[PDB]
Amino acid sequence: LTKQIKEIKEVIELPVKHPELFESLGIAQPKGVILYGPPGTGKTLLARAVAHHTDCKFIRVSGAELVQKYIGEGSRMVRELFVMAREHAPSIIFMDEIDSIGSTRVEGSGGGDSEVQRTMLELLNQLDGFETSKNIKIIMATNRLDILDPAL
Amino acid sequence: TRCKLKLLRMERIKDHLLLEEEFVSNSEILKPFEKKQEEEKKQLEEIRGNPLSIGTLEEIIDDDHAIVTSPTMPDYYVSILSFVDKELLEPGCSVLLHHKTMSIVGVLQDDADPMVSVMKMDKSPTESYSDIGGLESQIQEIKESVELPLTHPELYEEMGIKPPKGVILYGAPGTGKTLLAKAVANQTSATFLRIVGSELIQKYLGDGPRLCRQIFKVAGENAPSIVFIDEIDAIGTKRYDSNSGGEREIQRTMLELLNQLDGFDDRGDVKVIMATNKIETLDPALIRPGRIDRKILFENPDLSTKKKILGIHTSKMNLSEDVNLETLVTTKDDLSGADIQAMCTEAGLLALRERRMQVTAEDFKQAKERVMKNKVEENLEGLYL
Amino acid sequence: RSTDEFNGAQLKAVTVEAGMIALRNGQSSVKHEDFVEGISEVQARKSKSVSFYA
Amino acid sequence: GSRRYDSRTTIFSPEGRLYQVEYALESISHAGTAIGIMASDGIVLAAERKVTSTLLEQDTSTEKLYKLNDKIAVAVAGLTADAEILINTARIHAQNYLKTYNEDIPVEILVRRLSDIKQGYTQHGGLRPFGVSFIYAGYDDRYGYQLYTSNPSGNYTGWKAISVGANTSAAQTLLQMDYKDDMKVDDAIELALKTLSKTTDSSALTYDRLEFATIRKGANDGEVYQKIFKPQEIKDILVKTGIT
Amino acid sequence: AAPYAAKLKQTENDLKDIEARIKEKAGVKESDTGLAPSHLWDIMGDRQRLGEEHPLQVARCTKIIKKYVINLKQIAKFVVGLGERVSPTDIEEGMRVGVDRSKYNIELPLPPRIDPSVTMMTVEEKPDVTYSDVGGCKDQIEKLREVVELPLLSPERFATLGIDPPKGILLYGPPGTGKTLCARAVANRTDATFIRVIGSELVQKYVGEGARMVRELFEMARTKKACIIFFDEIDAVGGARFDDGAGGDNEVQRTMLELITQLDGFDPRGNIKVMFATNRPNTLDPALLRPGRIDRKVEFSLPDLEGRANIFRIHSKSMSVERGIRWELISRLCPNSTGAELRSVCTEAGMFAIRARRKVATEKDFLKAVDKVISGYKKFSSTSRYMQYN
Amino acid sequence: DRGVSTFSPEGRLFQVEYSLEAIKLGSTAIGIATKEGVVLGVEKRATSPLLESDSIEKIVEIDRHIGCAMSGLTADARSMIEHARTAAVTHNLYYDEDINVESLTQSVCDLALRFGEGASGEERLMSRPFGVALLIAGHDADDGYQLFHAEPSGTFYRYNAKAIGSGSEGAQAELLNEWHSSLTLKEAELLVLKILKQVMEEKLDENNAQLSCITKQDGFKIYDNEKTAELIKELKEKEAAE
Amino acid sequence: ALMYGPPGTGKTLLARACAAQTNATFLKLAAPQLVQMYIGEGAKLVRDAFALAKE
Amino acid sequence: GYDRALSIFSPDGHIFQVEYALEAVKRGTCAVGVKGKNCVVLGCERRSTLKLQDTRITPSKVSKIDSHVVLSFSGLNADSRILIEKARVEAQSHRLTLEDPVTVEYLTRYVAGVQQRYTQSGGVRPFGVSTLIAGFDPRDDEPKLYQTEPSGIYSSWSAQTIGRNSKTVREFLEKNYDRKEPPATVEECVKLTVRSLLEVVQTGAKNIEITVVKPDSDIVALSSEEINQYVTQIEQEKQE
Amino acid sequence: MTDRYSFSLTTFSPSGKLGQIDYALTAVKQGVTSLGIKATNGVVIATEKKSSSPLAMSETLSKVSLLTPDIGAVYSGMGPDYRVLVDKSRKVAHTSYKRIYGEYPPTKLLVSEVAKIMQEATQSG
Numbered sequence A: 001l002t003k004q005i006k007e008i009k010e011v012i013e014l015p016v017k018h019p020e021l022f023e024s025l026g027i028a029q030p031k032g033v034i035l036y037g038p039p040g041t042g043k044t045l046l047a048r049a050v051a052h053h054t055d056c057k058f059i060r061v062s063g064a065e066l067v068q069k070y071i072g073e074g075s076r077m078v079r080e081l082f083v084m085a086r087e088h089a090p091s092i093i094f095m096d097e098i099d100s101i102g103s104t105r106v107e108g109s110g111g112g113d114s115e116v117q118r119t120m121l122e123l124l125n126q127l128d129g130f131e132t133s134k135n136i137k138i139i140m141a142t143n144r145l146d147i148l149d150p151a152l
Numbered sequence B: 001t002r003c004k005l006k007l008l009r010m011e012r013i014k015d016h017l018l019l020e021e022e023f024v025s026n027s028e029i030l031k032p033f034e035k036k037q038e039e040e041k042k043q044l045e046e047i048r049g050n051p052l053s054i055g056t057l058e059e060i061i062d063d064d065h066a067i068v069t070s071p072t073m074p075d076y077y078v079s080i081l082s083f084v085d086k087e088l089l090e091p092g093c094s095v096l097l098h099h100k101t102m103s104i105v106g107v108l109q110d111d112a113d114p115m116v117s118v119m120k121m122d123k124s125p126t127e128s129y130s131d132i133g134g135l136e137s138q139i140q141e142i143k144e145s146v147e148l149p150l151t152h153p154e155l156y157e158e159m160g161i162k163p164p165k166g167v168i169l170y171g172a173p174g175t176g177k178t179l180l181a182k183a184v185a186n187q188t189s190a191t192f193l194r195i196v197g198s199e200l201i202q203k204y205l206g207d208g209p210r211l212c213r214q215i216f217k218v219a220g221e222n223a224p225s226i227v228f229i230d231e232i233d234a235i236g237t238k239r240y241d242s243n244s245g246g247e248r249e250i251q252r253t254m255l256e257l258l259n260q261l262d263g264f265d266d267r268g269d270v271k272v273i274m275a276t277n278k279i280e281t282l283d284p285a286l287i288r289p290g291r292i293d294r295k296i297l298f299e300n301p302d303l304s305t306k307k308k309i310l311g312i313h314t315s316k317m318n319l320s321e322d323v324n325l326e327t328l329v330t331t332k333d334d335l336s337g338a339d340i341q342a343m344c345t346e347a348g349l350l351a352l353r354e355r356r357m358q359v360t361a362e363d364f365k366q367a368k369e370r371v372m373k374n375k376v377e378e379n380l381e382g383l384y385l
Numbered sequence C: 001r002s003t004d005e006f007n008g009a010q011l012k013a014v015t016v017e018a019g020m021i022a023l024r025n026g027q028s029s030v031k032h033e034d035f036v037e038g039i040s041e042v043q044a045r046k047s048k049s050v051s052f053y054a
Numbered sequence D: 001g002s003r004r005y006d007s008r009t010t011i012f013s014p015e016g017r018l019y020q021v022e023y024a025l026e027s028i029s030h031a032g033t034a035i036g037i038m039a040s041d042g043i044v045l046a047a048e049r050k051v052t053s054t055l056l057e058q059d060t061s062t063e064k065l066y067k068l069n070d071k072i073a074v075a076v077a078g079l080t081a082d083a084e085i086l087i088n089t090a091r092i093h094a095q096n097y098l099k100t101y102n103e104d105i106p107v108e109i110l111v112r113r114l115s116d117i118k119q120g121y122t123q124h125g126g127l128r129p130f131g132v133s134f135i136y137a138g139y140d141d142r143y144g145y146q147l148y149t150s151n152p153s154g155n156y157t158g159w160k161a162i163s164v165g166a167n168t169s170a171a172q173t174l175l176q177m178d179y180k181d182d183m184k185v186d187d188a189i190e191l192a193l194k195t196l197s198k199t200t201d202s203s204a205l206t207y208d209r210l211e212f213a214t215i216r217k218g219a220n221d222g223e224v225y226q227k228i229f230k231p232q233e234i235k236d237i238l239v240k241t242g243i244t
Numbered sequence E: 001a002a003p004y005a006a007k008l009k010q011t012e013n014d015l016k017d018i019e020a021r022i023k024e025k026a027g028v029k030e031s032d033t034g035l036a037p038s039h040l041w042d043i044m045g046d047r048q049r050l051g052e053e054h055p056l057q058v059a060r061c062t063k064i065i066k067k068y069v070i071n072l073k074q075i076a077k078f079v080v081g082l083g084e085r086v087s088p089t090d091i092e093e094g095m096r097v098g099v100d101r102s103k104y105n106i107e108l109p110l111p112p113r114i115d116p117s118v119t120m121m122t123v124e125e126k127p128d129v130t131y132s133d134v135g136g137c138k139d140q141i142e143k144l145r146e147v148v149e150l151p152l153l154s155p156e157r158f159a160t161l162g163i164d165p166p167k168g169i170l171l172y173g174p175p176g177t178g179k180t181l182c183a184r185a186v187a188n189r190t191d192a193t194f195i196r197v198i199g200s201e202l203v204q205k206y207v208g209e210g211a212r213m214v215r216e217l218f219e220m221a222r223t224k225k226a227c228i229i230f231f232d233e234i235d236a237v238g239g240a241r242f243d244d245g246a247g248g249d250n251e252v253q254r255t256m257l258e259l260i261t262q263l264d265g266f267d268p269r270g271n272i273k274v275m276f277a278t279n280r281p282n283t284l285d286p287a288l289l290r291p292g293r294i295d296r297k298v299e300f301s302l303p304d305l306e307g308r309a310n311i312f313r314i315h316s317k318s319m320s321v322e323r324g325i326r327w328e329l330i331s332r333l334c335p336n337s338t339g340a341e342l343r344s345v346c347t348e349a350g351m352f353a354i355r356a357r358r359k360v361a362t363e364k365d366f367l368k369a370v371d372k373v374i375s376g377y378k379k380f381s382s383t384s385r386y387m388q389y390n
Numbered sequence F: 001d002r003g004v005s006t007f008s009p010e011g012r013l014f015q016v017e018y019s020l021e022a023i024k025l026g027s028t029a030i031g032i033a034t035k036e037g038v039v040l041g042v043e044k045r046a047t048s049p050l051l052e053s054d055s056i057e058k059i060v061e062i063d064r065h066i067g068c069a070m071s072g073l074t075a076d077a078r079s080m081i082e083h084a085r086t087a088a089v090t091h092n093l094y095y096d097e098d099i100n101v102e103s104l105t106q107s108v109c110d111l112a113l114r115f116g117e118g119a120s121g122e123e124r125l126m127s128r129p130f131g132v133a134l135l136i137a138g139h140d141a142d143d144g145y146q147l148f149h150a151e152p153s154g155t156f157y158r159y160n161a162k163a164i165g166s167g168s169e170g171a172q173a174e175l176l177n178e179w180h181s182s183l184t185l186k187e188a189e190l191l192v193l194k195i196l197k198q199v200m201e202e203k204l205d206e207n208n209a210q211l212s213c214i215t216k217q218d219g220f221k222i223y224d225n226e227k228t229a230e231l232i233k234e235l236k237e238k239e240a241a242e
Numbered sequence G: 001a002l003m004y005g006p007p008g009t010g011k012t013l014l015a016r017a018c019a020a021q022t023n024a025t026f027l028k029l030a031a032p033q034l035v036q037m038y039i040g041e042g043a044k045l046v047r048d049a050f051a052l053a054k055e
Numbered sequence H: 001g002y003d004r005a006l007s008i009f010s011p012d013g014h015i016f017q018v019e020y021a022l023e024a025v026k027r028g029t030c031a032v033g034v035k036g037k038n039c040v041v042l043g044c045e046r047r048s049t050l051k052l053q054d055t056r057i058t059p060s061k062v063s064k065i066d067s068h069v070v071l072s073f074s075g076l077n078a079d080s081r082i083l084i085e086k087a088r089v090e091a092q093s094h095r096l097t098l099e100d101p102v103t104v105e106y107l108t109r110y111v112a113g114v115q116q117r118y119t120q121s122g123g124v125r126p127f128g129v130s131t132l133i134a135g136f137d138p139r140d141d142e143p144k145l146y147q148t149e150p151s152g153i154y155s156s157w158s159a160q161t162i163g164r165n166s167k168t169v170r171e172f173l174e175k176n177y178d179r180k181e182p183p184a185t186v187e188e189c190v191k192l193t194v195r196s197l198l199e200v201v202q203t204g205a206k207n208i209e210i211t212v213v214k215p216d217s218d219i220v221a222l223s224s225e226e227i228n229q230y231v232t233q234i235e236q237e238k239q240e
Numbered sequence I: 001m002t003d004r005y006s007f008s009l010t011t012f013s014p015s016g017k018l019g020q021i022d023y024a025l026t027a028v029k030q031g032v033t034s035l036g037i038k039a040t041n042g043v044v045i046a047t048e049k050k051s052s053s054p055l056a057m058s059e060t061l062s063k064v065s066l067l068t069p070d071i072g073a074v075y076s077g078m079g080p081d082y083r084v085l086v087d088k089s090r091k092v093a094h095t096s097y098k099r100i101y102g103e104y105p106p107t108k109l110l111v112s113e114v115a116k117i118m119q120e121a122t123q124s125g
């Protein structure tokens, strides 16, 4: 899949290694980049390959509380995930919001998985000098980007 | 260029000299200190020794006793003795006990928390007012109630009456509400707390009410303060099951939001700033004017305001004589300011794909076609109903 | 007679409510005119709204 | 009681939109693609089936092309069952005008009345809107060749080209480049296969996934001819533009 | 450009190099409370600190056996005995006592229950809202003075009649009239202990967690004489009697039933006056609004057109105003307006005096100001719906 | 959704409570009935200086001795004016005689009752509403000048004077002081304007006010816009003597 | 024996007066106490309100 | 069969569906009306701009009802077809029974009549259409302009605008059309109606359609050339 | 008595397609199998017979029927909706081709008559 490999090496690796290229042009640094498509196409396996050359810590976040033990839930964890990923920059936070858990939660609220990604997004867009120097990328993934809450 | 470097060298001749002078006078120049500082440090240290066992104060008795509870568990009825002030003793506080006979040898303990980390902000935004310029008079109502009674105590004593309180930001999206707030907290340089309204709903039940009573005790302490509740609309839909949301969780958040901002509590200075895009779901006990004074109404700007708005974003980009800045504005017919900002991020994304490093008249008229296709592909009306 | 569908807790709420009316005047004895007038002060009634069509 | 069970198709949203109607505009874009092209010298009406199986008797079927009367043919996009109702109701209305004026129905009229029917389902009576859109291709003395399209809302507009069904945006930009106002009938044929051979979701464009029909004024003595081509003449012009 | 690029690389290295060396040195540099009198305390406190006066491992009695049985809070049970000279009346059931650190023996009994501490931070210390602050001279403000203030200041007059004095009072109405503005006023003037509760503070996930709280708060108010227990915002934990059959209304209805069985009580309440500030009497429970516990109930009204002409005297006399502002004139122009909105015309004429550059707020800045706040804060009815009945 | 059918367990048809709000939203309408000439005056509430003042109609002729002023949505009223016009003329074919004023109110009130479910073939040609009031004013031999107040309830009372609309509360309290039994036509006409001035949003002018009476000889007659401008001018002289 | 009905009928008031007057040992219990937040402390409170009562 | 009540009263004294009606109008196209002293002018902007889209056979948004009445409509365009239909019907049944063409007053009531009467029956949603009605009274010279609501209310106006961005052009008209002095001639009025549209159309002459009705059944449309000419004129003057 | 399903029971999904049409096929997929092969000079149609017991003799029930003497028909899916559908078909074939052209309908035309029934069983409430 040769057309996909270049598209993400352009907008993820290049405003980190060479902030001079994107600063002359004027383009405000990329925020969210949505990875979509049918399951099994390698949505996650592509960001894994980008996290190895750039030397990102690939932190797959998921809604899993097995790893969390310090706060014990990720509903209110925002600052702590940033402060571990800012120490250990560069980083790719691979936010897989599921949003295919049926129409009980996904159509009743916009799911519980997007709730955690919208709190993330508003605080990481401005926090310290990291807002046009983010070393913690906001990589989102979903089944179809249409299914996500409209305000995302 | 030179302006910046003269001042930066001026503060690195201050920092260097002060550190050498202040290190030498703690390790060589001792005369107002000397004997009297060597006796006081020697008396307090010998008298309490070490290790010192940290405890937590459940309650005081005024005859100089306390009931402290170790965090391990075994309770103790300790004595208040020597080298202690009772001004800081009070519930919740951290005291030092002597590990044999536990007497409160003093209080100096305050141990930061990861629950007071998420609330408090470290930020200092890299934009200040007049990068929001346009909708000019909408930041000149938030400056009359946030900035102005701190800066001039004179004018609000001269007219008398109580000063304003708060504001609500609501209106069309793409009207800048989020950066408007990020600008009134950078100007004043008051202690800016910041919480999204979606963290107030958690899977845990009745944990809502404990979290926002916490938020306001931190805020009262650091006062004067500005609290951003960004997106208090979000409390209207976000829910994980029907009892972690529903009437139950939504009433718990109201009740809480009602006590913090006006109650018997007799709150100190918390200014509140809310970002929102739902006015017709809020408590009718807040848009009661006289909690919240002037509310701010925002709409899509008009064609001459959008000339001031496109001039802030286009100095960033490379500049040419070819560029037709005035004709992107004209054609747009009351279109928001979040699109104007999605068009100049799209001009350098087409520019990089070519590997041509000039932004000219051609790159901006191409980037407007991509911005008008996503919002127009999502308009599936086609033949107008 | 002058009460009906008063439960015993409203009626303790009538005899006390009468002897306030006696403390407002200043009287030291609560007469039979105040127990009648305390009945209208505690009925679990203040009428929802004067009728507009009934 | 029964009000709970009531869908309220009829009601307006807080957008003021008919949410029901928007859904219906969907069910068209699932169905196979049909393209309208106006030329000065004829009208090429061209649509590629949605069906595809290897057991389809292509010779026997029409399903995308119906004649209304001898001057007016429609191409169908949506559910075929729904369509079939409308298409008979059209045919009767055409004839009703012929008995009363001995003068074939002008193309504007016929379209306007179909459009009125559709609208009525979404005014009142809690019916579900038809899932259908037509391309109208028709000829009279008044205006010449005329093209129209009507959508399930009951609102019609004229055109110099248009596409309905899947990949509507894709089709529309290919035509924007290529159509010049002067084309003959034979060049118009060649632009129709060209626009259908890119958009097709199936890999090959085959003579048995296509339906082609013409309306030409090159029939002498000042008369118009329709003709729906056989599946064996569409095969001969598939090799003509080199698709095989 | 190039001459200045070599100066942007120094600005980056240099601002952080400085920054680390300065914060470690500064430290708290050995600042510990005590100061100048604690040196005379060092003579007294060194002979007592070595005594075993402390520690006394705090325990708690589980059974007086006519000797005494304590249960440590570590779980390990011991039989102890009298101290140096303690009376046998001190040792009571469920009381904490301190026992000798080594061989366990009661030295000094200690007051009861270590659950009070979430109930001592709810008590406020004389509010500053005074008693003339409240609008009008209504007869409704004197009813607050006839249920709470008057029978505790003089129990001589309610002893001659013979009546049980009314102990309850409910404050209810539309917002903006001050239900909490007159319950602060009465806490300043009566000089009786005021105990504010938030009724939505009780809720937790662990059921009957608000049962513990409600018990201990009720005892803490029983001990002090003359108190007032002001429950605000009891629409949560004070809902209708219902039974969904499927939800989690089962946690909610626990805290209400425990609120019911103490109010009436086995052992009646002992000089406790009851205030309820509710938004609505409409969802409130049928066992709380049933009249022996409410006694006399005064709904605080929307001020009339004379009640706003009165109120308008509190806010316009404190501003600097030219002489001759008839308080009737601005009260007419205004439609039917609370007193929380009639306070905001002063504040909007005060912010318009600053714009116009005036040292005086006049009768011109109040006529404009009315027009702006009546339009503005009238439009859009919050939700503009509500209902949820049928 | 509430039914039209359902009861509120207080005993009330939710819909009637909501109708009686719609009156109050609409524009002010005063009526003062005296023993010498009923005066009806309403506030037009011209919403832009572009819109022509006199196209707007809220004083409406039912016949040539029953005039009528309406408050609320003027649309709802279009149906109920027409029904009232027919019925009064029907009676004049059928008994060659003026319809009683009281009787006409009843027939309006009857149509008002209608808003029903529309069960079987039964004709209830409305399903909803009639959120408007009338000040039905008239003169007949049986009782002198009368004035009647219709509701959307299907409920009407006679009234010596009644205000309705936005400023109804204020106008009501001035009416209980000022109303009397000795008023003349000329004093009542000036008094209506004075109570209408207080609750008018805008300054009292004839480009947002319309006056009318019904007097025994004339019948119905709406006043000239020239006459009204003169009665405005005379109010301020008497007031500026004081 | 159970006592139920409308409020105000002195249910709680009578029961107390007649259970202390007849010198039958009257234990005071309120059901909201048997609800607990510990796991298995409510089952230990019922058996202990019973064990006292058998003696 | 279907008669389920859709005029559920709002407890706040409104009707949910009649608000929504007003909303759907705002979505759709714009159209402006101005009355001189001897002409009326109906201009409307056309989003029928789209290369390869006819305008000969596509129907314009200004419709002919009668010889001397003309209608323009904003809001749902499927719906417009009805109110045309009914009004045409009317126009003939008036000649038939009373003689004489429709008074412009009358036809206004009658269109207004139809829209009210869809809020009464349960089986039907309100028409989300507002209209401009214009014409000249039989054998007279009296300009008239009327506009109706999907409430059913109606009023004459000196000039009005309905559809999208009506606030811009109303605010423009307050300053630039005096209420005591109409534009004198037919060309001076037309120059004034163009100038009003060219605020929200963002130039172009191909977009906008301008029809004028004068007294004595003069229904005429201005063709592309004329439009361009006027636009250009306004260009030189404005520039200068 | 009073029908109060006057409104339609079928409506479009907020994702597009009618919900009940889609369901109705899944019910056809459960059914008995049957097949059809068109040959040059005849057609063959054939189905199996699924009973409850060997007590149920399935000879009496016919799953293959005649519409007209020349057009037969076979089905899968709901047994009872076949019983009536064939009746409706025979009856309206006769009232639209037996009176008005004598002869039994051509085979295309009869298919289309059946198709009108179906569409319409979805339009009416």
Ligand SMILES: Nc1ncnc2c1ncn2[C@@H]1O[C@H](COP(=O)(O)OP(=O)(O)OP(=O)(O)O)[C@@H](O)[C@H]1O
Pocket: B131, B132, B133, B134, B135, B172, B173, B174, B175, B176, B177, B178, B179, B180, B277, B301, B309, B312, B337, B338, B341
């Ligand atoms: N009136 C304006 N003046 C100057 N800049 C503006 C204006 N409006 C929008 N912008 C720019 O657009 C950017 C995107 O805006 P932001 O994300 O803060 O908008 P928003 O209205 O807060 O969006 P939302 O509707 O999602 O709450 C801003 O950060 C700001 O620079």
Ligand SMILES: Nc1ncnc2c1ncn2[C@@H]1O[C@H](COP(=O)(O)OP(=O)(O)OP(=O)(O)O)[C@@H](O)[C@H]1O
Pocket: B262, B285, B290, B291, E133, E134, E135, E136, E174, E175, E176, E177, E178, E179, E180, E181, E279, E311, E314, E339, E340, E341, E343
């Ligand atoms: N009667 C009054 N007289 C003077 N001022 C009043 C009165 N009522 C309210 N206010 C003013 O309005 C402010 C806010 O009102 P308050 O918060 O007491 O409303 P509330 O009655 O407690 O409503 P809720 O509890 O439902 O939100 C007060 O601090 C006071 O300045």
Ligand SMILES: Nc1ncnc2c1ncn2[C@@H]1O[C@H](COP(=O)(O)OP(=O)(O)OP(=O)(O)O)[C@@H](O)[C@H]1O
Pocket: C008, C009, C012, E264, E287, E290, E292, G006, G007, G008, G009, G010, G011, G012, G013, G014
């Ligand atoms: N039958 C009665 N005779 C005399 N007094 C009564 C009677 N019923 C109630 N009362 C008075 O009402 C008071 C309150 O009654 P109490 O609260 O004990 O009754 P209850 O049925 O338990 O009501 P609830 O528990 O719902 O509050 C009693 O203390 C008593 O003074």
Ligand SMILES: Nc1ncnc2c1ncn2[C@@H]1O[C@H](COP(=O)(O)OP(=O)(O)O)[C@@H](O)[C@H]1O
Pocket: A001, A038, A039, A040, A041, A042, A043, A044, A045, A046
């Ligand atoms: N492009 C690919 N190259 C090699 N393996 C792939 C590719 N795409 C998917 N896979 C394989 O398919 C499986 C699914 O990959 P994953 O990235 O986890 O899926 P999803 O999109 O559902 O998150 C893996 O075992 C992976 O190795």
Ligand SMILES: [Mg+2]
Pocket: A043, A044, A096, A141
């Ligand atoms: Mg994955």
Ligand SMILES: [Mg+2]
Pocket: B177, B178, B179, B275
């Ligand atoms: Mg924002």
Ligand SMILES: [Mg+2]
Pocket: E179, E180, E181, E232, E277
């Ligand atoms: Mg309060």
Ligand SMILES: [Mg+2]
Pocket: E264, G011, G012, G013
């Ligand atoms: Mg009891």
